[PDB]
Amino acid sequence: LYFQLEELELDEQQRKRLEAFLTQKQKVGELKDDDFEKISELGAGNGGVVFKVSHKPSGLVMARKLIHLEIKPAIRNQIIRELQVLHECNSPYIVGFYGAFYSDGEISICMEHMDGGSLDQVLKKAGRIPEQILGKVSIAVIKGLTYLREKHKIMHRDVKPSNILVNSRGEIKLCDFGVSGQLIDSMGTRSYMSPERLQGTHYSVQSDIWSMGLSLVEMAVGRYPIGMAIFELLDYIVNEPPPKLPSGVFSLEFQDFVNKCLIKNPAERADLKQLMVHAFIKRSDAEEVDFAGWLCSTIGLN
């Protein structure tokens, strides 16, 4: 393999892991519905269902997300085409992608299986996720959001605990980002949308910062921090002060970090550059946290 990795400043462990995923990916060609065998259901959301599958020609275990869309063939083919950009989205903070295709009213998004599942699944087991672990989560989310914005000019548009994937090797990765404009166009009791997004305001990385901040407070406290009825919830986000991390249990740097993510005004709200040099991030990056060890003990893995 003739790797074109230099654009990413990677540690040797990150370089080895990314190279091992890309090498495994070389076993995979054209994806067909007939070449998959359903192992189990990993989970489901509003738009689709994701299954742990076996890709029979390669032997690879994958996570197959199926999104039901029986629409005009010309527009589903535009979607499938827009999804091919995912082949170029190589980052330690972005879930690996094997391929995307359409079959029998379903668009399939085949990706790297993350054996730790999502952070909302681990939150159920953990109760509360430790501040120090959330420091590593914060770094991975900022770096992933930065990679997407800087390298592919894409915004996530759907940052939430269920869209942050973890594994037994201690990797933290984003998934379900807005790579396809046509998929967004063609496509509850909890909302992670920024107050300005809920009012109609054009999307921005600032909205992703809000979603990240809210997700952090939820994971830190063990529950959705607003609270409930639909309008009641959205009226609270738009017209009431943002939620705050409780005092006496969390560091001042972590409280200040989430406060800067949750500023109602998107202009005063912190950007990715400012968040990357925030005391919380600087502290968290210097800490030796055995995230892989903590994850394997709280959810019972390797």
Ligand X SMILES: Nc1ncnc2c1ncn2[C@@H]1O[C@H](COP(=O)(O)OP(=O)(O)NP(=O)(O)O)[C@@H](O)[C@H]1O
Q: Mind telling me the catalytic residues?
A: 158
The answer to the question of whether 148 is labelled as a binding residue is no
Q: Which stretch binds ligand X (CB under 6 A): 116-124, 192-200, 204-212, 251-259?
A: 116-124
Tokens of 263: 């500023």
Amino acid identity of residue 139, one-letter, is I
Residue numbers followed by a gap, the chain, C–N over 2.5 Å: 187, 227
Burial of 9 (0-12, 13-18, 19+ CB in 10 A): exposed
Torsion angles phi and psi, residue 67, rounded to 5:
-115, 115
The answer to the question of whether 45 is labelled as a binding residue is yes
Q: Maximum Cα–Cα distance for the chain, whole Å?
A: 57
The residue assigned the tokens 């489901």 is 44
42 binds, among Mg ion, ligand X, ligand SU5, none (CB under 5 to 8 A by kind): ligand X
- Residue 184 touching ligand SU5 (CB under 6 A): yes
The answer to the question of whether 152 is labelled as a binding residue is no
Rounded to a whole number of angstroms, the minimum distance from the CB of residue 41 to ligand X is 8
CA distance 302 to 108: 29
CA distance 17 to 277: 26
Query: How many CA atoms does the CB half-sphere of 272 hold within 13 Å?
Result: 20
CA distance 283 to 127: 24
Instruction: Give 86 or 245: the residue with its C-beta nearer to ligand SU5.
Output: 86
Instruction: Give 162 or 284: the residue with its C-beta nearer to ligand X.
Output: 162
Contact letters (x/-) for Mg ion, 168-187, by CB under 5 A?
A: --------x-----------
The answer to the question of whether 293 is labelled as a binding residue is no
Q: Which stretch binds ligand SU5 (CB under 6 A): 11-19, 51-59, 179-187, 254-262?
A: 179-187
109 binds, among ligand SU5, ligand X, Mg ion, none (CB under 5 to 8 A by kind): ligand SU5
Chain positions contacting ligand SU5, by CB under 6 A? 65, 86, 95, 109, 111, 175-180, 183-184
Residue list for the binding site for ATP: 42-50, 65, 111-114, 118-121, 160-163, 176
